[PDB]
Amino acid sequence: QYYGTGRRKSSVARVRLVPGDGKIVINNRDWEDYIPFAALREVIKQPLVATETLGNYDVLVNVHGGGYTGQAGAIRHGVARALLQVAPEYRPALKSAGLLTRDPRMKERKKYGLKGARRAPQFSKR
């Protein structure tokens, strides 16, 4: 229950939320290991810190795809969409921090005549 499938870059994160103690499960693996950076760890709890429910629910995460930071962003959007399903009363609170928005930034495409997205080969006058 409480399905809040969220996305970031190339990552898709399906999150089912249940009341509990606060344990986070990612692909049948402890979340201390999957996310090594404590800096990447705080952003996971932003939807859980605007509303005081951090030590009340357990998240079961089955993410697939994207880089290690990619799942961190996609799991933040994952819980917020699922948490908003728990009670619509949280919408003004989460909207203030811009947590419902799905980030639209994606890596560009390479262009012919260019060495990347916008890099231009060195110009020589003469």
Partner 1 sequence: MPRKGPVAKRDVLPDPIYNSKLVTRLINKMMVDGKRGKSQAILYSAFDIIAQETGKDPMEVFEQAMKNIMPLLEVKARRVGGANYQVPIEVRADRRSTLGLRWLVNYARLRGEKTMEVRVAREIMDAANNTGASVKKREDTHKMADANRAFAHY
Partner RNA sequence: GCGAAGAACCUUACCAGGUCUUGACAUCCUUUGACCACUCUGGAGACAGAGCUUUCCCGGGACAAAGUGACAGGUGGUGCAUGGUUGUCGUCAGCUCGUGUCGUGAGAUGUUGGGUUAAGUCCCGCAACGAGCGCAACCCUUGAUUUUAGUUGCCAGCAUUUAGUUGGGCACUCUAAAGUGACUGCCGGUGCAAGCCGGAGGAAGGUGGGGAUGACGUCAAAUCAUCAUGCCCCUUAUGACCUGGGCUACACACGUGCUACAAUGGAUGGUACAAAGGGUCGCGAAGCCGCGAGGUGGAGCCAAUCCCAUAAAACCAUUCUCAGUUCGGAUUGUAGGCUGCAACUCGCCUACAUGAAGCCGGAAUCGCUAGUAAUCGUGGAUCAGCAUGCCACGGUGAAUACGU
**Rg (the chain; Cα; Å):** 18
Which of the residues 12 through 31 are near partner 1 (CB under 8 A)?
Answer: none
State the minimum distance, in angstroms, from the CB of residue 25 to RNA.
10
CA pair distance 109, 107, nearest whole angstrom: 7
CA pair distance 26, 6, nearest whole angstrom: 15
State the minimum distance, in angstroms, from the CB of residue 22 to RNA.
18
Residue carrying structure tokens 């509990």: 20
| Neighbour count for residue 94 (Cβ, 10 Å) | 19
Measured from the CB atom, is 5 or 46 closer to partner 1? Answer: 46
7 binds, among partner 1, RNA, none (CB under 5 to 8 A by kind): RNA
- Decide if 5 contacts 74 (C-beta within 8 A): no
Q: Which of these ranges, 11-19, 26-34, 38-46, 106-114, lies near partner 1 under the rule CB under 8 A? A: 38-46
Instruction: Summarize as ranges the residues that interact with RNA (CB under 7 A).
Output: 3, 5, 7, 9-12, 14, 16, 34, 36, 60, 62, 64-71, 91-92, 95, 98, 100-125
